């Protein structure tokens, strides 16, 4: 029993973190096989960031302008190239700790673990979601640039996020591991702001199912709703529309608990319309949207507390 915001064990990623330095700028990189991946902003002074032309800035650099430190060992850079907003530094040594891995670009609403790192040294691990507005609500300080987000499935690390910057509202923006930003953001010092965000409806429904599996039913009701009528209410409360695909994805949780998806939707509609009136769900006084249906299945028992 119990339900916690749970990250994946971070050891497979810890063994990949290194420090990259170019000139006076230092940040983290990810060392897989004989390549180190890091934000291309490592080549910029803070003055370069106002209107960088990265192709122009990088042609001015040579391999020896890049210092890569892995623990107590300097790795010699023997090639470099830029892919979107990431730099790829070929080094003379393959990381003996390279896990089985993939790079994946995730959809909004998916969750992942972040290994926050400073100067190549992992600091902490936490779980977060890609928001609908393509920011993450992370926890990052100066020096965190280059930290990665990931999911793990049967000892294969799927990397999905590399950290680049913090927006004025304190939320975070970054790229996939091929250097493509999530959202409209760019690696330039210019006005950029997070768009209005929305709540991830299918994840709130999954978490209501987690609450039932763990033995709680107080918020349920005898009603149902049509998908169309639910979405009319969702739109009013700044929730994303629920699609039939989301309904299908919630099938396994629905089957485990005996609560039809549209019936859980009627429960959520009532919660949005009336509030919680002093009650909590899974220890929270707000509706939580950072657990996917897969997260719930992975963490909860396969036997419901009836």
């Amino acid at each position: 029993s119990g339900f916690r915001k749970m990250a994946f064990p971070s050891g497979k990623v810890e063994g990949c973190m290194v420090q990259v330095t170019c000139g006076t700028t230092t940040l983290n990189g990810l060392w897989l096989d004989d390549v180190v991946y890091c934000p291309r902003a490592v080549i910029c002074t803070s003055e370069d960031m106002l209107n960088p032309n990265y192709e122009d800035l990088l042609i001015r650099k040579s391999n020896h302008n890049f210092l890569v430190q892995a623990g107590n060992v300097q790795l010699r850079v023997i090639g470099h190239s830029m892919q979107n907003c990431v730099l790829k530094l070929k080094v003379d040594t393959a990381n003996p700790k390279t896990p089985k891995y993939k790079f994946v670009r995730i959809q909004p609403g998916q969750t992942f673990s972040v290994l926050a790192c400073y100067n190549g040294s992992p600091s902490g691990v936490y779980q977060c979601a890609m928001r609908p507005n393509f920011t993450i609500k992370g926890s990052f300080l100066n020096g965190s640039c280059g930290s990665v987000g990931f999911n793990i499935d049967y000892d294969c690390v799927s990397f999905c996020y590399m950290h680049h910057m913090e927006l004025p509202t304190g939320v975070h923006a970054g790229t996939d591991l091929e250097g493509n930003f999530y959202g409209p953001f760019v690696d330039r010092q210019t006005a950029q702001a997070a768009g209005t965000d929305t709540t991830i409806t299918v994840n709130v429904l999954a978490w209501l199912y987690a609450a039932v599996i763990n033995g709680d039913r107080w918020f349920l009701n005898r009603f149902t709703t049509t998908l169309n009528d639910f979405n009319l209410v969702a739109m009013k409360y700044n929730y994303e529309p629920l699609t039939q695909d989301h309904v299908d994805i919630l099938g396994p949780l629905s089957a485990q608990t005996g609560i039809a998806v549209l019936d859980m939707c009627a429960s959520l509609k009532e919660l949005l319309q009336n509030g919680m009136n002093g009650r909590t769900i899974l220890g929270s006084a707000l509706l939580e949207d950072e657990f996917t249906p897969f997260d719930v299945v992975r963490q909860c028992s396969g036997v419901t507390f009836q």
């Binding site: 940040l27 960031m49 300080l141 910057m165 004025p168 923006a173």
Partner: peptide, 9 residues
């Protein structure tokens, strides 16, 4: 504001 790149010095 602008944005904050989070490298280190």
């Amino acid at each position: 504001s602008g944005v904050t790149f989070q490298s280190a010095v």
